[PDB]
Design a protein around this nucleic acid. Structure first.
Ligand code: ZN
Lengths: 50, 119, 82, 60
RNA sequence: UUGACCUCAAAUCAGGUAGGAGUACCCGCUGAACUUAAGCAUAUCAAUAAGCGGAGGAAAAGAAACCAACCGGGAUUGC
RNA sequence: AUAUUGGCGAGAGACCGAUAGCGAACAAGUACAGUGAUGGAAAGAUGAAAAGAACUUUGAAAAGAGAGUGAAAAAGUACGUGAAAUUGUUGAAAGGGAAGGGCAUUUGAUCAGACA
RNA sequence: GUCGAAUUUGGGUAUAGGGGCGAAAGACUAAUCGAACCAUCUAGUAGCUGGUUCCUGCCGAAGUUUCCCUCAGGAUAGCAG
RNA sequence: CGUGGAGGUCAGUGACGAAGCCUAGACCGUAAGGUCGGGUCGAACGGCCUCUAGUGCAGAUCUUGGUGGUAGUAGCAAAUAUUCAAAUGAGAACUUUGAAGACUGAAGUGGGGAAAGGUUCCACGUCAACAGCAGUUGGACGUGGGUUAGUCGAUCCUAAGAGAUGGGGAAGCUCCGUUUCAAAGGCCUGCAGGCCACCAUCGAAAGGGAAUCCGGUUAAGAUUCCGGAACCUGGAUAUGGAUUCUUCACGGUAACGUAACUGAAUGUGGAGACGUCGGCGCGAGCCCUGGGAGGAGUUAUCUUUUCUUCUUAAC
RNA sequence: GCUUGUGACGGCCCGUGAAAAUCCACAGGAAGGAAUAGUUUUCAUGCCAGGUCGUACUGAUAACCGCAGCAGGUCUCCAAG
RNA sequence: CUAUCUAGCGAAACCACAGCCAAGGGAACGGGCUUGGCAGAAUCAGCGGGGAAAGAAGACCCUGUUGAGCUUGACUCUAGU
RNA sequence: AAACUUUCAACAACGGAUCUCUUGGUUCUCGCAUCGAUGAAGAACGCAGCGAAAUGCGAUACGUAAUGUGAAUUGCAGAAUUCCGUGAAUCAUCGAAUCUUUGAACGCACAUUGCGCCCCUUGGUAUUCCAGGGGGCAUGCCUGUUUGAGCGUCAUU
């Protein structure tokens, strides 16, 4: 919020890295079951609660 | 492959420090190369080499300290056995076997005997 | 008056993050975590909250030290090496 | 421009730079990027060429 | 003046220890009501659940200020 | 000697078998909700093996049509089987403010059963 | 309607459930208030409402007595098997 | 009669096709149901004597899931309003550019921010999904980039107030109190000297608060970057200047004045530090406006005309 | 003239309209001080450093809460003719 | 501006099956039943009589050997004093 | 007669029932006793060549060392300095180390990546200032050590 805790910003980078799709080389792994990330987040729809 | 601790354990503190410095330098250069090129897994080996070097150095100091406190009353807390807390307290073999003198006399006079029932 | 327009007056977090429970449960004005109980030394637990007990109790995490204890006990708390 | 540990500070950074690269540092600016890293802008003195040292380092 | 004693203090003194976790079982403490009574207040649920303290690998109890009244038995615990 | 839904390591069952059985057979106390305490999911199956459809053609492309692999594509990542409600096409048939049904029979379509 | 005071308001702070606050309406207390929210006891109990899964055969009722803080229910006798 | 499962038995059936499903094809049974034929499908299953049970649904405003008529219906109607042409692209009511008209009309549909949000900001690519039409566009999707401080804030101070300590109550998690019935230390000169003391701590991105402005710059950043010019704090220090033989300055009647011009504990005082309303004066900015110097606009006619630049920070 | 700041005044009150950190001054007279020189760092000049975290963007008829790109609600500064 | 017609999009309540009436009888007001009147596809915009229309396990009433709030010289206790 | 409505079959659709399967659950019996200030459980953050998570680890970061096996891993590339070797593997085992910031949590605090003090050492002229590095600074209780107060109290100068 333009004057924000560093703890907060730490978590921001965390979420920024956690918001992405799968690398696709995993889908070719032997005996995989993971086609798409199930834990993604978009700011429009759902929130973090920080 | 890379380096081996059995080759390093014959070396000294100074040679090891130089080795470590060289490894960190090389690692820095490899990080530069990693963005020049798509992928660079030679960096893993030097990363693990650093770990092995630090392990050996730590071992040297630790064993030096151990032989320094060889057979002393108070050893350092990071050098005592860890066994578990309740044991690090609990009685010793000595203290457990401590016995009053009355009980000593009764034990010696009348210990349990070996006997058998046939005839 | 109390619903949809009133709920627009909500921008004052009554709770922050704990350093202990990591939850958005640290009350500010009260300075307590209604899940961890920090800054009390006792962990907050209640029998009637058994679901809650097992949401947090050992098993729920990494067990950085403990997981190796059965190995050590099985060995008999070894010393040295081969 | 450099990526730096979060526990760092300008003094340490300055020091380490002259150490590693044999340079006179004019000044330093820092920031914490949104990606959870420390970006470090570092001005040199006029006695040096940031460019020459960059391709000395092998990034260019 | 000097030297003791008693008491109480200090010290980042030397060395030690307690905290918290877990808590199926265990020793305690505190402690209800729905309920049942075809109502309900005693009573019951219950000396329970909830709440608090503290342990172990088992605990606790245990070598009789006992059971008895028989011709007497003989630590404790459990079936 | 006794207690033990906890912890660890074993071994078993006239148990449940993916709407069951622990809430969870899968990145489940996860996702998600709630200021908060707390609440709390759904979600299994190609094939022996991806051999996961080379190439051609139409199209902007998705895709289709081909071709082709494979035991099978009536196994083509919406994939084991693949039900019903429900819907499309085809075919047959009826129909004046319901439909459906019992007895009886015509008419129509279909069908078994007897001998050397 | 009021619009310069008993004004309006942000932010911080205090007050917590038989408790709080209340220029008093039983009003407000996170869309919840003649007793908040969450979990538990708890599957609380319920003479009351609803529901209660396959066939055939054989038999075949009662709504009346007596007592009950008993009258939408029970026990008992009777009918039935 | 039938379902799940168990013991036993048919030296039971079966990949040359098990169960499962469909079948206005057939057969048996009063019936519960059983059997057969065809199609599909692909790995286990049945008959009989017994045993065992979480054992047979149309209902419970039952539970979970799914699909329907309603129905291509209701309806997508506030916030004055759009239109032409090009480019793009497969494709343009809606993208871009351009041109017209129009609005908000500064109490703005502008510009900036606190709370909150968290990368949405920016670039490229990109339309399967969202944007209740559309979609070449996007706060979308995909990948990357981007947030620079001695001077801004936090950091410090304390307010309402919370909250340790000594202590006391409490079986107890804990409760009370924060000039507390406490043996509560640090100030200068290893030590001798010497003076003081209600001494936790937290509590304001609006209160108090040391100090920075300009011009430029990016796709996206700037009082943070660049160029230039300042300031403050802290610490080092050395040259100058000043003062002294009357050692610790002189002038002014005084108000006071100066480039400096000793001054410990200790004490006193001040600034921090402060309501609101009224009108009056002063200044800054803005508004209006005159001449002159540039540029643009109108110019059938008129208009010595309409508009616009003429600025100067902190220190 | 508008916005604004500001000064001195006046009215108002049973209301007289925070605190502390912090800086400075004064009273004081401890102490230490010149001549071959000695004293002074609130005058000037001169050298070095100045850490940590925040800094993008919106702030709303699309970035906040209202299950949503909801005609709602959300505190504030500038404000031309 | 709507409704209306069109391009595109695209729900919902409700739904035993359904949808022409009279009289009778009936749980004493039937869409169905009995006797009669009648009866021709598919329908469109409106329309607001009926569908004892939907909304909601009636808030009035009675019951329940179900409660709660409040009161009180009710029964029984109680912190306090 | 079409359409439309309705029924039946086929084929295709919606949907995921049924059947078969099952690295799961549940229940029972056995056996054992091992958390933690020598810093736990738990939390947050970050770590891979190419990862979002799960999993594992902690700046030595899907791990280091030692031991055993004895030549893999695997989605791609890279390796192979080997493959009769003190030597592959996400192997197993595990006794030696690392063990971010926290957490009972221990310098003080904690919506702060906030502000101090002691020792040693290093740079800047530096005992005094700044910075870096290294190590330390909780409370209560016990045992004792040293220093200490009290006309509490003894003996003598
Ligand atoms: Zn917390």
């Amino acid at each position: 919020a333009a004057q924000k805790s560093f703890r907060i910003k730490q978590k921001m980078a965390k979420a920024k890295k956690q918001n992405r799709p799968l690398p696709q080389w995993i889908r070719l792994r032997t005996n995989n079951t993971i086609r798409y990330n199930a834990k993604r987040r978009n700011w429009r729809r759902t929130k973090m609660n920080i | 492959a890379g380096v081996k601790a059995y080759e390093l354990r014959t070396k000294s503190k100074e040679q090891l420090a130089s080795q470590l410095v060289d490894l960190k330098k090389e690692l820095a250069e490899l990080k530069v190369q990693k963005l020049s090129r798509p992928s660079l897994p030679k960096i893993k080996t030097v990363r693990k080499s650093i770990a092995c070097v630090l392990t050996v150095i730590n071992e040297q100091q630790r064993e030096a300290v151990r032989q320094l406190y060889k057979g002393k009353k108070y050893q350092p807390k990071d050098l005592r056995a860890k066994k578990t807390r309740a044991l690090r307290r609990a009685l010793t073999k000595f203290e457990a076997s401590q016995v009053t003198e009355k009980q000593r006399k009764k034990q010696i006079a009348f210990p349990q005997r070996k006997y058998a029932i046939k005839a | 008056g109390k619903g949809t327009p009133s709920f627009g007056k909500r921008h004052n977090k009554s709770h922050t993050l704990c350093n202990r429970c990591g939850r958005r449960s640290f009350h500010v004005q009260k300075k307590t975590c209604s899940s961890c109980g920090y800054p009390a030394a006792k962990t907050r637990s209640y029998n009637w909250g058994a679901k809650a007990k097992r949401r947090h109790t050992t098993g729920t995490g990494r067990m950085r030290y403990l997981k190796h204890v059965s190995r050590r006990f099985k060995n008999g708390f070894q010393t040295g090496s081969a | 421009v450099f990526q730096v540990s979060m526990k760092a500070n300008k003094y340490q950074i300055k020091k380490a730079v002259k150490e590693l690269y044999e340079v006179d540092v004019l000044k330093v600016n820092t920031l914490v990027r949104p990606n959870g890293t420390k970006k470090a802008y570092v001005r040199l003195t006029a006695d040096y060429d940031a460019l020459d040292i960059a391709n000395r380092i092998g990034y260019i």
